[PDB]
């Protein structure tokens with residue numbers, strides 16, 4: 655690793671990680687599962703009614719957006735969503751002990767997974783959680799690769815899985 659390469663982990667954090675997995679879009683679009691989304695992976699609603707999604711958006715941003723937001727607004731919503739995922743882990747009796755056992759980089763992978771799937775979805779991965787707590791990284795990654803979360807939308811999940819396997823930021827290099 656060059657000096658520059660050794661600096662790379664200090665440039666990566668949960669915000670940069672999710673920004674890569676989710677992308678940044680200033681207009682309402684449908685995600686790989688067909689759900690209306692905006693900003694940095696902000697799911698607006700699961701309903702197929704665009705009007706519902708716009709309504710959610712205006713509520714979330716606090717103004718008449720007509721389906722469009724600014725970069726600054728995307729960032730604020732993103733920071734709210736990250737905070738929500740972190741809070742969801744820490745208050746959960748099942749997720750917290752696993753999170754606490756993890757190193758810093760795998761904790762980011764955990765927050766990412768919760769950001770994507772929600773608390774109950776993640777907390778339902780009983781075997782994966784046990785494997786992570788036991789540092790069975792290869793098995794945990796293989797089991798995550800069986801999930802609908804990954805298989806329905808591999809590009810959004812693949813880097814998170816690799817990160818659980820390795821505890822490094824390598825999957826986020828060389829975009």
Ligand SMILES: O=[N+]([O-])c1ccccc1
Pocket residue numbers: 743749750751752753754763764765767768776783786
């Ligand atoms: O909160 N966690 O320990 C956690 C969350 C998501 C995936 C794996 C572990």
